[PDB]
Coordinates of C-alpha atoms and ligand atoms in Angstrom, one line a residue:
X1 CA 119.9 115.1 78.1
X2 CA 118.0 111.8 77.7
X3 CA 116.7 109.3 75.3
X4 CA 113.0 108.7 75.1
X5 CA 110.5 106.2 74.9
X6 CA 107.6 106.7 72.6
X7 CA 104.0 106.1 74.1
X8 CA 101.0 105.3 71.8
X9 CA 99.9 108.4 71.8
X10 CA 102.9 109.4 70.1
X11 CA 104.0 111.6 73.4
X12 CA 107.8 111.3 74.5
X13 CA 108.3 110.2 77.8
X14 CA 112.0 110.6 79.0
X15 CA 113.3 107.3 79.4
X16 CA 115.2 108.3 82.9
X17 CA 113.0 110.6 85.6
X18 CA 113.4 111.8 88.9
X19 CA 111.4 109.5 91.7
X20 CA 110.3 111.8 94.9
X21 CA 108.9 109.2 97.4
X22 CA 110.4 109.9 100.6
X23 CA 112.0 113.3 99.5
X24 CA 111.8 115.4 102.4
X25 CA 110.0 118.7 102.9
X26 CA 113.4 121.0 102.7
X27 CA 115.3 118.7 100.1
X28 CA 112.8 117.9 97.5
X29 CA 112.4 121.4 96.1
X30 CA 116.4 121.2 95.6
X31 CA 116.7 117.6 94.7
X32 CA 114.0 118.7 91.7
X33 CA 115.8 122.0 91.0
X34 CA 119.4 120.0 90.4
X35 CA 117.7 117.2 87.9
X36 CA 116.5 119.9 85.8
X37 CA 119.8 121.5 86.0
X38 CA 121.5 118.1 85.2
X39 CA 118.9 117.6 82.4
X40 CA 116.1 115.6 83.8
X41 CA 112.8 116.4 81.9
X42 CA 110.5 113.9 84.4
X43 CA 109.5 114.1 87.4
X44 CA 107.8 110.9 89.2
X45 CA 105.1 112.0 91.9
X46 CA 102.3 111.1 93.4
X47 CA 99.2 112.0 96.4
X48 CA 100.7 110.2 98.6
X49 CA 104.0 111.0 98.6
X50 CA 102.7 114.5 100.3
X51 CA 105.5 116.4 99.0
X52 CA 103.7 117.7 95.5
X53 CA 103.4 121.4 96.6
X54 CA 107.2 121.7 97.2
X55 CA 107.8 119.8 93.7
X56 CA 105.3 122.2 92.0
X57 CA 107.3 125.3 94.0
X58 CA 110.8 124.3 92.5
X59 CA 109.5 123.5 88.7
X60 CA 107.7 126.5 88.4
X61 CA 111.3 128.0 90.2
X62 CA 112.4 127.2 86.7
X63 CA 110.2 127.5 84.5
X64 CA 110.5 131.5 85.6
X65 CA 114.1 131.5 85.2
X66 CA 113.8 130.3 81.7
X67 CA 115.8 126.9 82.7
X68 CA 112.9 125.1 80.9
X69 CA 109.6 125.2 78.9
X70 CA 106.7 123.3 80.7
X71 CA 105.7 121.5 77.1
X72 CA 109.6 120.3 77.9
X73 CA 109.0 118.5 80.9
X74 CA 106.9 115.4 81.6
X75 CA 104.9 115.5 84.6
X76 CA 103.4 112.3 86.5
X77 CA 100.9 111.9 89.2
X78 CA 99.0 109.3 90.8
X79 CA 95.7 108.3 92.1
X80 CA 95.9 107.1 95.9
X81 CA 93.3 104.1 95.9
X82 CA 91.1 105.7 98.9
X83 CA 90.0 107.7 95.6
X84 CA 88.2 105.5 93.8
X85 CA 85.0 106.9 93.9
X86 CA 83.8 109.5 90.9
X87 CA 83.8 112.4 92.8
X88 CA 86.9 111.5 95.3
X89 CA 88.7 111.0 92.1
X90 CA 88.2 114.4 90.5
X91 CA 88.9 115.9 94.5
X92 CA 91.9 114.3 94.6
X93 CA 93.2 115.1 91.0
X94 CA 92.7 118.9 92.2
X95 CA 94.5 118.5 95.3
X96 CA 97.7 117.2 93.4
X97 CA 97.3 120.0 90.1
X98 CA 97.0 122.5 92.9
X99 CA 99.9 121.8 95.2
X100 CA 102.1 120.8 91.4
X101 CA 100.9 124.3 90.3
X102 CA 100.1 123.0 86.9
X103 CA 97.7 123.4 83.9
X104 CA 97.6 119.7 83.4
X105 CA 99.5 116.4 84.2
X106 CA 101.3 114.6 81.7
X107 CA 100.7 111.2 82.9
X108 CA 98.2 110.5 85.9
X109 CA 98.5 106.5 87.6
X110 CA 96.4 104.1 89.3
X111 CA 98.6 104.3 92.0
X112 CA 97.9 100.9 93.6
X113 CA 94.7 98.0 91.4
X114 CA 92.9 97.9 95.0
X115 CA 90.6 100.2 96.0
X116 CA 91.2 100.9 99.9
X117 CA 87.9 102.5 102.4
X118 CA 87.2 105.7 100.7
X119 CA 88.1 109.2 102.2
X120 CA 91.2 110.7 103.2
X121 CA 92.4 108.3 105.6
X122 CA 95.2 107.6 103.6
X123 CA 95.9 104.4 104.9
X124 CA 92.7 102.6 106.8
X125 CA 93.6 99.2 108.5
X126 CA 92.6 97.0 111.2
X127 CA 94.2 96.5 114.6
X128 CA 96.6 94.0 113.0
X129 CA 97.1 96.4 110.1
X130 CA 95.6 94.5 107.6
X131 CA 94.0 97.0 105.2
X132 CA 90.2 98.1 104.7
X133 CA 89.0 97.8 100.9
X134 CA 86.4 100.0 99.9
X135 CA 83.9 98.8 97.4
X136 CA 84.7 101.1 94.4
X137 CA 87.2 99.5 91.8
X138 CA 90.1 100.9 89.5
X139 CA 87.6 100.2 86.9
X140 CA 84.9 102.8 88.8
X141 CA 88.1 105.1 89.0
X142 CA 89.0 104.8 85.5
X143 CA 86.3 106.4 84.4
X144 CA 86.2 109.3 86.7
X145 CA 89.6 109.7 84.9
X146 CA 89.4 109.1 81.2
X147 CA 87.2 113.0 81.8
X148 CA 90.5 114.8 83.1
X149 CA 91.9 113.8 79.7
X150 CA 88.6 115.3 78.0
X151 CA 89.1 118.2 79.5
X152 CA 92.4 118.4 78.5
X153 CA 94.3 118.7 82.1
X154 CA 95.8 115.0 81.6
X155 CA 97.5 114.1 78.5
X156 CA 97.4 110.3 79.1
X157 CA 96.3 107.9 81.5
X158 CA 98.3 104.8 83.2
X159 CA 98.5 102.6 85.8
X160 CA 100.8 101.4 88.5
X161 CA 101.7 97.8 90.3
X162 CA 99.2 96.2 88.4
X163 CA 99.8 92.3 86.8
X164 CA 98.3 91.4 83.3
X165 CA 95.4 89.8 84.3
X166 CA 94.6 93.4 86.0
X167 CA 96.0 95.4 82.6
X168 CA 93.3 92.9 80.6
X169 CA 90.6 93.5 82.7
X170 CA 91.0 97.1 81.8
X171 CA 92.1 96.7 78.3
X172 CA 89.1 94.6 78.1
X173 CA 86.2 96.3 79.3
X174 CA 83.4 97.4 76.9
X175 CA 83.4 101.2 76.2
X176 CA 87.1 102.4 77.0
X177 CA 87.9 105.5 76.1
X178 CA 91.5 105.7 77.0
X179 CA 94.1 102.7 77.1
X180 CA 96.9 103.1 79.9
X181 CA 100.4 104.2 78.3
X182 CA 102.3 102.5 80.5
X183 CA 102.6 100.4 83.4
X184 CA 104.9 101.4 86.4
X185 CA 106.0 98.6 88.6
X186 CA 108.7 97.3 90.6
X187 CA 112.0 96.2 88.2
X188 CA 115.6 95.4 88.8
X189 CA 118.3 92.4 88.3
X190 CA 116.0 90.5 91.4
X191 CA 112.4 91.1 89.9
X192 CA 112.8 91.5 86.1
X193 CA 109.7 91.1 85.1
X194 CA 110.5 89.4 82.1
X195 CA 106.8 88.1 81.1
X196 CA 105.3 91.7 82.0
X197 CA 107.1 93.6 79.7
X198 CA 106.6 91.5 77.1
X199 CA 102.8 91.1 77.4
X200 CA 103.1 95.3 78.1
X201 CA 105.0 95.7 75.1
X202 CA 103.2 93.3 72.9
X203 CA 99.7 95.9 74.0
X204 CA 101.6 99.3 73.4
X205 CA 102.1 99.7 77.2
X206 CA 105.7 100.6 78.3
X207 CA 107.1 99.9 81.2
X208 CA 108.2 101.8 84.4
X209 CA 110.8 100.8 86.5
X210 CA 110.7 101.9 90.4
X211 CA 113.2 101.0 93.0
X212 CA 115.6 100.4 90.6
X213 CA 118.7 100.6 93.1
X214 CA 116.4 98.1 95.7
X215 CA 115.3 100.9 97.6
X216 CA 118.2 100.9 99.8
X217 CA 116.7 103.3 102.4
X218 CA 113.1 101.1 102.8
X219 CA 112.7 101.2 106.8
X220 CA 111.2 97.6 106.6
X221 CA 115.0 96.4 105.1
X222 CA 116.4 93.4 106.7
X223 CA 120.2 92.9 106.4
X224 CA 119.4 89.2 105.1
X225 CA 117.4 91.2 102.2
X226 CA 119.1 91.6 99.4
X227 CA 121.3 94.9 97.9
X228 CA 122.0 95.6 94.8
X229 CA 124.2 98.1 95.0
X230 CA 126.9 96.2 97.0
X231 CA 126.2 93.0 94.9
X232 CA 129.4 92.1 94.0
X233 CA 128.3 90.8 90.6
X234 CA 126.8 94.1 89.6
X235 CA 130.0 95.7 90.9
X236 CA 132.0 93.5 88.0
X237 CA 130.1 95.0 85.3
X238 CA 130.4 98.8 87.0
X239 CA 134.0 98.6 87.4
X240 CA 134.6 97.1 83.5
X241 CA 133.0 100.2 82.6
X242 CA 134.7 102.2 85.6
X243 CA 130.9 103.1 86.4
X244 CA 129.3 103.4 90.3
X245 CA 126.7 100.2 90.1
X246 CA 124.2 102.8 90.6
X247 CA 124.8 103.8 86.9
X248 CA 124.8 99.9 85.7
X249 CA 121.3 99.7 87.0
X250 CA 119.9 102.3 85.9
X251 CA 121.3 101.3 82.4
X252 CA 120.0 98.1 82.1
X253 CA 116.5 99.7 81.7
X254 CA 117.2 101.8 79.3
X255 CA 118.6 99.1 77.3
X256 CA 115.5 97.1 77.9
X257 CA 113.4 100.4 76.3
X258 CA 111.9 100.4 79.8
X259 CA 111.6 104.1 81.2
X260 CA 113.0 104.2 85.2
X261 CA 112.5 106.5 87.9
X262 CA 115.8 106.5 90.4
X263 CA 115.1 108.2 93.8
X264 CA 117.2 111.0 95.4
X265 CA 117.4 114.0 97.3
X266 CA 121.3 114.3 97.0
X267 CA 123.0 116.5 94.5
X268 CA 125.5 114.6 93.4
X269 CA 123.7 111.2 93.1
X270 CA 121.4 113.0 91.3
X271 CA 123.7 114.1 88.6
X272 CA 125.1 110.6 89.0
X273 CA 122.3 108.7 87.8
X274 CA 121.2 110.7 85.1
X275 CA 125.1 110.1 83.5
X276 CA 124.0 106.9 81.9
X277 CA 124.1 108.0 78.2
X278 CA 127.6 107.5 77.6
X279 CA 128.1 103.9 78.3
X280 CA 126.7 100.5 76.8
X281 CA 126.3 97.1 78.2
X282 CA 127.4 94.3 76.6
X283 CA 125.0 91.5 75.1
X284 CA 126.8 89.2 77.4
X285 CA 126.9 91.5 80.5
X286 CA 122.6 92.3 79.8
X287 CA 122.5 88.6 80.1
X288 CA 124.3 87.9 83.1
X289 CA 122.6 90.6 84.7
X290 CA 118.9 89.2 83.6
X291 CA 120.3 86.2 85.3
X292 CA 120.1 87.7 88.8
X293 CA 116.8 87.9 88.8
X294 CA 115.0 86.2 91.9
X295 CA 111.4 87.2 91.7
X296 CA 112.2 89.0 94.7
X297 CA 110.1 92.6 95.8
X298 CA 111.7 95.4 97.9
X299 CA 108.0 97.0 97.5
X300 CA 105.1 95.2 98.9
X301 CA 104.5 95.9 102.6
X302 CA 101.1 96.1 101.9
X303 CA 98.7 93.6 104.4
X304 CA 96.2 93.7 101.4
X305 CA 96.4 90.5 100.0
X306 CA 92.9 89.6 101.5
X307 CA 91.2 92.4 99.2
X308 CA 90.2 91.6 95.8
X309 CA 92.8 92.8 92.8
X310 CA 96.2 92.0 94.7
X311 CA 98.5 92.0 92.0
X312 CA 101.3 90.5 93.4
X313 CA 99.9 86.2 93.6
X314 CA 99.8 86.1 89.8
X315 CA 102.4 84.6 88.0
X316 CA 102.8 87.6 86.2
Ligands
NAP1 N1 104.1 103.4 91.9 C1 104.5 102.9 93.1 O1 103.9 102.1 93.8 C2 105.9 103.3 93.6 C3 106.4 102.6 94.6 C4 107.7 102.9 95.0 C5 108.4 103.9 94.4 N2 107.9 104.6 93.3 C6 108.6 105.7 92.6 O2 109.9 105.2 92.2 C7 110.9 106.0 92.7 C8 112.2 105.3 93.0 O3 112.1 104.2 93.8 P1 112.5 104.2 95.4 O4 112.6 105.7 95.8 O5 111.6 103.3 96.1 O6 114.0 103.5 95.6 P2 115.3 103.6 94.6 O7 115.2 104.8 93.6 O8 115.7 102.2 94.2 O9 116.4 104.1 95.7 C9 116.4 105.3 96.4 C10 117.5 105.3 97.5 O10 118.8 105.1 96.9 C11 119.6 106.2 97.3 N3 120.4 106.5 96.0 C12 119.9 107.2 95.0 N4 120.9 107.2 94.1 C13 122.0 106.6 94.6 C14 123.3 106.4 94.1 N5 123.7 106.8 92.9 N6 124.2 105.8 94.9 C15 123.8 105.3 96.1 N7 122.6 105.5 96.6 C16 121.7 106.2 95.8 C17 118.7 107.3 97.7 O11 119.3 108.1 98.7 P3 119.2 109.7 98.8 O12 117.7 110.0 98.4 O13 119.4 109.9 100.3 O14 120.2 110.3 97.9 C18 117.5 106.5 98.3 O15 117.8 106.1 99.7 C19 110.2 106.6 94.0 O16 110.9 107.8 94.5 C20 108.8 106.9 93.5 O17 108.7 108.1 92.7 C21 106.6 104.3 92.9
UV8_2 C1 103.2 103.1 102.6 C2 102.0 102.6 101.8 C3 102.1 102.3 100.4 C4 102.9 103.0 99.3 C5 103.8 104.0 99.6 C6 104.5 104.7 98.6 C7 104.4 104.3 97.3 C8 105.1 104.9 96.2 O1 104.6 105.0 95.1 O2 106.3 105.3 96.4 C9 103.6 103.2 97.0 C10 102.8 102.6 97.9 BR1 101.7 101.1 97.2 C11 101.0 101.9 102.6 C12 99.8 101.3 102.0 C13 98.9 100.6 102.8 C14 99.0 100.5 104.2 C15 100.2 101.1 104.8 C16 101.2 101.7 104.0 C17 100.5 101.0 106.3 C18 101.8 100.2 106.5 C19 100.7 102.4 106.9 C20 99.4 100.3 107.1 C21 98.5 99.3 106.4 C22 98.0 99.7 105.1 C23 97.7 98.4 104.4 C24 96.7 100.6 105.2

């Protein structure tokens, strides 16, 4: 049973959820059905992903067998930037409230600040694989979405991988009708994003953190990359507490007030990474961790760095 973090619309958002990227068709509906078991409220998901209509098939699973109330549970989605324009936008949204079999979404994302060739080739490149940007922007898509929360069938808006200069642009334009609650980005001891959170923060925006664990499973992983989980530093501070590291880095979010998504389709990592709530790190141990951090992305193997909006140049 977890903590929260309060977003400014006074809605709690449980500070640890369930990511789904990658879940396979055949594990996600159990991997879903054991976090709620193990007392996971939210579930991370998105368009993309492909894999909403088996995460809608096991939380309505238990919502029937009375394991928990939908008004319990925090439900987010995201916008694949191929959707940008108006109508794509509200297709798109009904496509993933469809296959989630829901009433309405309790967060929906900008998935990704670029807006990609329209239509529902996901992923529209060149030869070289360089992708091909379309001309509607987050801001055209935006609005298409601030109406979903009109109607009622999203609770609050928010965007994803996007850097402040992207987050002002927003907060910034003339005639907003909803503010994003929260940003969800890349964050763990290698990348943590100290001067984004605070300007998130300091703008009643909290922060998500994906990849926490370094994505360990990422196909485009080099063994000169980085892992956190068998850094032996971060295995210090798990074995004073006679924690898995899995555990430490999950914590150091939550002590950070930032809300964090952990990945999995196995049972008992699942369990695992949700039994952060009886342990504390030290000030000291907080700080040596913050110390690891290397500006360094598991997430970005996106050739769109020729398009307008890439977050990932600025400083922060
Ligand atoms: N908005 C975005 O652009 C964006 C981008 C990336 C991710 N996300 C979201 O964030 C979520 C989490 O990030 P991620 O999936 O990229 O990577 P991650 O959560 O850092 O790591 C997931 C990997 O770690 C393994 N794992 C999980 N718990 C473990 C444990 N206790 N011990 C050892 N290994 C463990 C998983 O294996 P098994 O699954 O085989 O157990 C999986 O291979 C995603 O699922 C998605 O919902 C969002
Ligand atoms: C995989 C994908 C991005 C992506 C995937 C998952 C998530 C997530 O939220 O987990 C988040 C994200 Br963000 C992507 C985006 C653009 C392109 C590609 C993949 C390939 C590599 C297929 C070809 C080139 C382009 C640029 C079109």
């Amino acid at each position: 049973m977890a903590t929260f973090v309060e977003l400014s619309t006074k809605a709690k958002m449980p500070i640890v959820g369930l990511g789904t990227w990658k879940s396979p068709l055949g594990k996600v509906k159990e991997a879903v059905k054991v976090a709620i078991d193990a007392g996971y409220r939210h579930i991370d998901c998105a368009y993309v992903y492909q894999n909403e209509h088996e995460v809608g098939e096991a939380i309505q699973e238990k919502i029937q067998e009375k394991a928990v109330k939908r008004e319990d549970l925090f439900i987010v989605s995201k916008l694949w930037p191929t959707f940008f324009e108006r109508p794509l936008v509200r297709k798109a949204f009904e496509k993933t409230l469809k296959d989630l079999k829901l009433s309405y979404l309790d967060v929906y994302l900008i998935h990704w600040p670029q807006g990609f060739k329209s239509g529902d080739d996901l992923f529209p490149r060149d030869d070289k694989g360089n992708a091909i940007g379309g001309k509607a922007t987050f801001l055209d898509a935006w609005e298409a979405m601030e109406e979903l929360v009109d109607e009622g069938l999203v609770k609050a808006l928010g965007v994803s991988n996007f850097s402040h200069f992207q987050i002002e642009k927003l907060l910034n334009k003339p005639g907003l009708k909803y503010k994003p609650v929260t940003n969800q980005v890349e964050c763990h001891p290698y990348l943590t994003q100290e001067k984004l959170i605070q300007y998130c923060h300091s703008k009643g925006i909290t922060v998500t953190a994906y990849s926490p664990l370094g994505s360990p499973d990422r196909p485009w992983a080099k063994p000169e990359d980085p892992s956190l989980l068998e850094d032996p530093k971060i295995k210090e501070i798990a074995a004073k507490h006679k924690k898995t590291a899995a555990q430490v880095l999950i914590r150091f979010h939550i002590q950070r007030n930032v809300i964090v998504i952990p990945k999995s389709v196995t049972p008992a990592r699942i369990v695992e990474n949700i039994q952060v709530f009886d342990f504390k790190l030290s000030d000291e141990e907080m700080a040596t961790i913050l110390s690891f951090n290397r500006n360094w992305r598991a997430c970005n193997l996106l050739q769109s760095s020729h398009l307008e909006d890439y977050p990932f140049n600025a400083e922060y």
